[PDB]
Homo-oligomer: 150 residues x 12
């Protein structure tokens, strides 16, 4: 019931998070570009991995994934702003951290709901994704001179 | 630049095309699934390649690529409808053919405009992408018992 | 952990039979789609072979004694085998695989439950991972057959 | 002297060159459900055919013979018949033509095997044997696609 | 080619039983040398599976109908299985594999002869290559056991 | 998550000392089977390092402070070390690896239990995956030693 | 677009004949330098094959009907074939390859001009890439023969 | 710069000098970001080397004679070298690489126009490809420096 | 003798075990701009430290020695001093600390070289020389990042 | 019962050992135009010859035999003759001597093929046949380099 | 053996005989440990073959004339070969490999000293690298045999 | 000293590299198809010595020559205009002369570094000398000659 619901919510949020990463990848300027620009590609690959896995779990459960930009934008809780070259490197990384914290919380909610329903395959998908996102939070926060502060 | 304008048109349309390919990938049902489902993955990778290359040619030119779903939806001439499992395999492939035919005509436009403005680097990007997309139209149309009808 | 051991051994038996059935599909397949589905069966057989080895060896690790003869496989399995027949349609063969896989998924579910109850978390995860991938196949097979997964 | 082993090897060169042309035609002119699988499958078959061609030709050279090596020689010596490319041939009909080409090659390789066996050319004999074995396995597979027994 | 088809099919059943025995050995092995012989059993199995797939699909190719159920395998195989037993020594396990391999080599020799007589040169080659490799393994296993190959 | 944090750090100390013990065995090993077990220790060491990095990083991720000095490892670990001795047999070296592994598996179970109770599901999976692998090695080592795994 | 189509088809026929000539060279080559030049013809044939595939398929893609019989290749090609002869010198062989390659290079230049005029830029690019590599081979072959490229 | 041969030869001398300058930067680099930018200079030099080989051998294919001595490179290049200095900062090193790339992109434009007017399409393509990647590097280099590409 | 070669090899065993522990600490406690490049760089260094550790200890074994092989032995014999991990240390302080360890290792390896050279143990001699070469390259690179000369 | 197959396998062991030694000499003492292609080509020939040696030797072991396994045994049993290395043998001569060795090996392999066939040893028979195939192909290519037909 | 060329040639003869001995060991081996030690002989032979090629070619490079006939090898080598014998135990086979390696290590020390005395530092390095790896093998072989390396 | 010969090697290796490029480009004659790519192999090996010896210089606290002018003023190798009408045999002879020079430079590097006790620099020269001298044998053999080091 609600496992399906949280899976679809992730499809929308992951689709918006991918667009944001792409913006950061494109509009980035400042010392650290040469390391953080390609890093955003590893992030988007990882984000797309969850996206594909979660929609197909949803298809497998007899659901209907969001599959249009209108659905993604309307249903996602993340918001987007116009690309701006003037944003600082640190600010871009902080934006990525924010997105990631949101996803880790969305994945937590996914774990709980699927746990309570006994959909253990879905539970695991959410657990694996959360683990990696949290490790990423640690490293970005470290780059930014901060504790992960989960 | 009109070259900048078309590169950005391509960013939006390729974003939408990518979304439509995902939908086709997810909602596909019928004989041929097993060959056409992972084939949508190869198309999406290729579309992603154009997306990043066209966007970064645009950045290189001093432009500012569309980088929010809002901008993609508003600027794209591609139309998205809700996902639907009861569409035929042959109708899904016809929809990909439509999208590709539009992309090939957009890339021709981009070729034209860049050729008129002496931007040969951009001219080449459009030409490589059109070539490959036109090859895919031939193959899709052959699967459908049809000539490419370019 | 008596019941976890017992369900690991059940899987050993059923996987062994599933493997045989998939091999029969592979060999006896005729019809449009052969060229895609014939090697597909090899992929499924490799994946089934991996559950078999992992489950059998978890059973050993736990102090069990896995079924290890064809006669044990055949009599302990709940899956039924019929003589190979070239005339079965592609579509019927795919449905036959779906039926086998639905059985395996339900058995892996019982494995999940039994082991969760006894607190054997390792066996739990083994069944959970196998169940995820079999269910994914069921979606794909059903989609080829023009149907919803109907799990 | 291996007169007939040499002769069947050159018959093979001619027949394999024409077979290659036919597969290329099937590859290009194919249309219908199953295109996406059978189209690249034709490249695999061509690659295999090309391997036989190069091996059988260079065994012939090795034996002191002179392989056919012009289109005119290929066409005039081959027993395979070519027709104009046509997009309105069905998939099942294209696969059926590949099967008849393959049945021919398999019968030709059986003749290569027997002739080389009788003349004591065991190397040539093994070449024809390996080629026959794979062509016959393809015939099984293609025939299966077409809902048929291999009927070797 | 009635006889070739027959011995190809006998090979399918015997290979399937050989595979199951190799799996018992893999699983139930205990004693010094486990760490080398346990993965070695995987290699033998992959090779046995290769013969199985190849001989079965030669049979189909000839117009035959491969055995394709466990019941058929057990009933048609000349190999006998017993319950797995951890108390068997490494020596005894390896000796058991040797006797399976000797049986298979002899069956492949019969395969070679019958296909030779019937003029089925492709089947003939399949049995010959398999026989070559099995015989090599017998040498090595025998050498491990301190013995001549004694073919 | 104070206790999950605590058992993660316990594991950092214990894995560090387990690592050092594996090095001793690798170096001081003598006897029949050296050539197989000497490199096998490298594979165990690599796997141990894997758990170590992952566990310490999970701890850093949770806002903890991993033990990171030989002093900390050696005082906090429950594993005891002794001077290297070439005169130990192969079989006793292997039995010492087994004791280390049984310790780690028990510790990984405590880690699973605790983390389950604080609802730290990520840390929980880490202990479960590591426990599954170590228990499998125990089976294998015991088999070499002619014994049941006896977990 | 009628002529881009005609030149792509001309190239289908000419590449088919060029391929055949390279094979003759490969087979009948004798003399010092056989050992590098014999497998070099294989590289050239693979390259001629790549153009053949790309140009026939671009033609298909534009609504054309590629030549696809040996009769069609032979009658439309401007390249002439003679019987293989082992007595031809290495250097005469390489000269014959140079003459084939110069013809192809001129054909690709006409390909380029015609496609350029009709606005078929994709076809245009295909000719230009092929012309570029064929001209580099011309340079290299001529350098072997102690000569300037002389394009 | 009279023609394609002329501008290709100019490219040969300028690329050789750009190669040397990139080497200088790689060696004398000091400051935060060394660990990224030091090996990045390798990638640039490798790419530069690529253009060098391509253009020189386009020039040889066309009947020309590439500069092939340091004297020729120094005297014909429009780039200016200075003595290596460790006290140049990372940001100044990168700005200098940008300056070299800006020069090369402009050379490549000239080569494009000249070859386009002469109808040497192959040479045209060579300049176009090189220019594309060089201009992309200026974007990235400029972004590291907090600036727009400013082509 | 080869008493002194054996002794320096074992000193390296202890110092490399401690160096390895220090690099792990830097790897984990690292915080600040540059983390993303330097954190995985610590892995590369540890891998190279462990290659040295494995080679020298086993040269020792090969020579008839008994390498140190307990955490107590490493801590008591090493001249390197360890302190508690601390996330407050800046990136540039962490790098400086790695430079100290490396300078110490390179000096030790010189000592290893001189001693093995004076003893005629040319195999052991080469091992120190190879390790010394790579460590000193790392010092140059680390110093460069810190805007300094190698100052060997 | 398999005495004749065993004897020819062992003959091959001795001959192959000596062939490997002749090829090494060719590799080492070669001088003249074409050195750069033919020098490494002798390594490929030697690896191939080593493959036949190991395979034929362990076929002999598999059949109950005792392979020759000493230089003395290889010299005494081989029918190939060795001469002192000489830098002034020309390239054409070096290649002609390889052809000589290869012609001898192909004829030895034909003998092994025949004997094993007569004894019903079909495994041994196929080993010789595959080796013969490959060596005869080498004779074609070497002769072609030399401007000659293979003259098998 | 009065110079570097003379000791290089001595190594050619001795490595040739060592190679022959290792093949005998590989072939005539029987007993527990066969499966590990039979392929290990292959690795030792590849290594010995690499010294042989490097030392012989160094000798050529120095103006020398390497032994290159079995007669030369056998008459110049100090190693003695005996007839193959299957009843030699595995430990006896490994003990013989150790004796050969001890001889080789001593030869390489002599090559090291001689080339050092002459200032042929390239030859010196070759003997030093070979010596190091042979000594490491002696350690590992002796360890299998439950012994110190005793160099 | 070691620093000094390290830098001389930077200069000479740069010029050797440029000479090898010329041989690569201007080559004509039977054997082109073998020798033209061999030049790339040599060029890569030279570039590897350049990088190693230069960074050893940097590592010892010196300042590598890093402009074409310094390369050319300091190298003892002579450069001539490219010429398509040189025989292959003549091409390979010029390469031999360059490598014989480099080999002798590396012996000087070896001798000086051993004297100075800079063992790391010593091995770098020893490794490069070994490979260059092996190339000399092979080139000479192609030329029907003994290596004559
Ligand atoms: Ca049917
Ligand atoms: Ca027991
Ligand atoms: Ca025994
Ligand atoms: Ca002992
Ligand atoms: Ca002639
Ligand atoms: Ca001569
Ligand atoms: Ca004895
Ligand atoms: Cl700008
Ligand atoms: Cl022991
Ligand atoms: Cl000639
Ligand atoms: Cl000569
Ligand atoms: Cl000792
Ligand atoms: Cl000399
Ligand atoms: Ni997907
Ligand atoms: Ni990008
Ligand atoms: Ni297993
Ligand atoms: Ni060929
Ligand atoms: Ni199969
Ligand atoms: Ni880490
Ligand atoms: Ni194609
Ligand atoms: Ni080049
Ligand atoms: Ni080790
Ligand atoms: Ni062997
Ligand atoms: Ni060699
Ligand atoms: Ni460098």
């Amino acid at each position: 019931a609600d496992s399906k619901a949280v899976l679809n919510q992730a499809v929308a949020d992951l689709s918006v998070a991918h667009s944001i990463l792409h913006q950061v990848h494109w509009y980035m300027r400042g010392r650290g570009f040469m390391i953080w620009h390609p890093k955003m590609d590893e992030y988007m690959e990882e984000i797309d991995g969850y996206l594909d896995e979660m929609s197909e779990r949803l298809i497998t459960l007899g659901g209907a994934p969001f599959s249009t930009l209108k659905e993604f934008s309307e249903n996602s809780q993340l918001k987007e702003v116009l690309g701006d070259y003037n944003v600082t490197i640190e600010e871009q990384l902080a934006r990525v951290v924010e997105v990631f914290r949101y996803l880790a919380a969305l994945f937590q909610k996914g774990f709980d709901v699927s746990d309570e329903e006994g959909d253990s395959v879905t539970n695991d998908i959410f657990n694996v994704a959360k683990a990696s996102i949290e490790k990423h939070i640690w490293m970005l926060q470290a780059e930014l001179g901060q504790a992960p502060k989960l």
